[PDB]
């Protein structure tokens, strides 16, 4: 009688205290609405540029539209940012200065913003313990690793695509080799990725045309800046490709590519580790046996092993079964992997 009323009143108090969270959470956003409505009251600002300063207090501004004006100094700001050569902002009333406007390339934001999150990718590369060559034996992952450390820190996102040395006009790409590598020599930290270099890696065996001679001339600038009269002790380049046969044996000198990393799945612990990191979100039956999948797989591609395992998960979803036994893994990874061996020419 008395002992039950404390628990019952605890239940009424429970259902009474469980209704505040449905309102007090959205009231912060509702008040944030009026906070923004009070934040949109700072309006009517214009821009300008400073060329010549006569008086330390009042100088000449240059507007983007073309007409020039002169403004004063606001009591809040100081003479630090007031020096000429810094783009600033102005107001329509009294031509006061609220703050400055830092310059940037319309494109510099694109070249300095593309970023890729994910910090576990550095430890999701599997059992893998002045230039690096990522060649193309029967095993993939050249992009998941470079994008794994590049997604970890990379200190930048200086990606160099092999399609940026096209130079449709006269082949003066030396301005871009010295321009971008001059940016690499300017910025103290720099990491360079060179993916799919086989397209620009012509062996120039026979007499090349004008299209090949300019690309091989950019390769001559690469020679002149790797083993020429310029060291590359601090900058690092990652030459990724697809076929390790046409990789410019003139460029295959060990003076540039110190080590060679054959991206494959040789070790049973590396294939088992990559199989376990790719087999994370998949659900299976209690019968688990990875040694048959790892043992039967010999010299395959990592991401394509993910595509074959998920292809076996779809072969198992054809029968719309929630649980997925490893029989379709052995027979579907077996048969589909044999089809990859057929299409591995």
């Amino acid at each position: 009688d008395y002992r039950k009323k404390l628990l019952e009143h605890k239940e009424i108090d429970g259902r009474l205290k469980e209704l505040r969270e449905q309102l007090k959470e959205l009231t912060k956003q509702y008040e944030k609405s009026e906070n923004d409505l009070k934040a949109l009251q700072s309006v009517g600002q214009i821009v300008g540029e400073v060329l010549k300063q006569l008086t330390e207090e009042k100088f000449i501004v240059k507007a983007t539209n073309g007409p020039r004006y002169v403004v004063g100094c606001r009591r809040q700001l100081d003479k630090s940012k007031l020096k000429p050569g810094t783009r600033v902002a102005l107001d329509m009333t009294t031509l006061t200065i609220m703050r400055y406007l830092p310059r940037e390339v319309d494109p510099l934001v694109y070249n300095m913003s593309h970023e890729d999150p994910g910090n576990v990718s550095y430890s999701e590369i599997g059992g893998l313990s002045k230039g690096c060559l990522l060649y193309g034996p029967p095993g993939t992952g050249k992009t998941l690793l470079a994008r794994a450390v590049a997604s970890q820190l990379d200190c930048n996102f200086l990606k160099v695509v092999s399609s940026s040395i096209v130079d449709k006009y006269i082949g003066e790409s030396a301005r871009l080799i010295r321009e971008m590598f001059n940016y690499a020599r300017d910025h103290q930290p720099c990491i360079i990725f060179m993916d799919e270099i086989d397209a620009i890696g012509g062996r120039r065996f026979s007499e090349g045309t004008s299209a090949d001679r300019e690309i091989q001339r950019t390769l001559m600038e690469l020679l002149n800046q790797m083993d020429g009269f310029d060291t590359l002790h601090r900058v690092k380049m990652i030459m990724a490709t697809n076929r390790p046969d046409t990789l410019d044996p003139a460029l295959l000198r060990p003076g540039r590519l110190d080590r060679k990393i054959h991206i494959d799945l040789p070790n049973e612990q590396a294939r088992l580790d990559i199989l376990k990191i790719h087999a994370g979100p998949i659900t299976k039956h209690g019968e688990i046996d990875y040694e048959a999948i790892v043992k039967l797989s010999d010299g395959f591609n990592g991401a394509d092993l993910r595509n074959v395992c998920t292809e076996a998960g779809m072969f198992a979803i054809r029968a719309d079964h929630d649980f997925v036994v490893q029989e379709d893994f052995m027979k579907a990874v077996r048969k589909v992997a044999d089809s990859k061996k057929l299409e591995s020419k």
């Binding site: 009231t27 902002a89 830092p102 994910g118 990606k159 399609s163 076929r243 998949i282 979803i317």
Partner: protein
Amino acid sequence: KIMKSEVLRVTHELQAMKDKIKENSEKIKVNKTLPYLVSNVIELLDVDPQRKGKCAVIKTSTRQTYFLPVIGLVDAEKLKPGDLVGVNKDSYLILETLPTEYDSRVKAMEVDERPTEQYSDIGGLDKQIQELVEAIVLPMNHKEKFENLGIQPPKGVLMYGPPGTGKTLLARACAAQTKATFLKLAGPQLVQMFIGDGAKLVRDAFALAKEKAPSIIFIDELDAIGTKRFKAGDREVQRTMLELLNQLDGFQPNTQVKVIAATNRVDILDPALLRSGRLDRKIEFPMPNEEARARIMQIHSRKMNVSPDVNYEELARCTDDFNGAQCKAVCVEAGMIALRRGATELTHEDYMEGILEVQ
């Protein structure tokens, strides 16, 4: 319960807040009614040293540059360098941002809602088309099971084979089953007179696929521009093409709308087209035999008044090394001269008459 009696005052304050938000929330309609012009927005992060640094660069349509910080409501897809933003008369604030992509010559390339033909128009290809029918039905309805199993559908499917096989009308026939928006694109459309057009066409395709609703983008004649030359125009198509491959390799959020491709020949096979997001689904579509051609010609000719005395042996013998769209042209031609033959019923000589007529 004496300590829990103060909750009533809190609920009265909250319902009073809901009663008082109607006015300041009501002026949203009269202040944010209509942005009268369109102004381009360029994102540029500033630093104030709360007193936090946040600003943006504005450009009006009349070529006038002004100054304003990043303001408005809660932004999720905003803060991108886009156009068609909300702005009042003279205060120049940002109220309603909406992406423009406007250059309608590329935006309105092929505005198709849905086609008429379906997958039940062919015969003898279920063993090789069933994988594609699954690969378009299960990624559209079974998104829930993709989290229990951890499955991400591939975005590049290579529908390759000899020409004239009707792969375009067949992929469109499956696009009727996709129920999504169908958007064609031709290979020779990337080669333009001006420079950098292919970047606008590719970023436009991923602008409508990325921005718009879940759709279907089927391209064809990709082999006509997929040449791996070692100036050259196909190397410019290597700039645009390798740019697209960079947008299918460097973009992990590419889990959105797929990109279906079809090549009429595999002579110049680009080796860089092998990836989970790239053209990994390589299902070979050979030339249909006389049996399969009699099947697709029978189902494509099931509407005309065909004579029941068809043993398919004469047409099976005459159809040697033919294709799907060729027998479709024989069916259409038979439906063309069968009208002027007087007999409303399709005869048996019209098959070889059309075969020797158009071929």
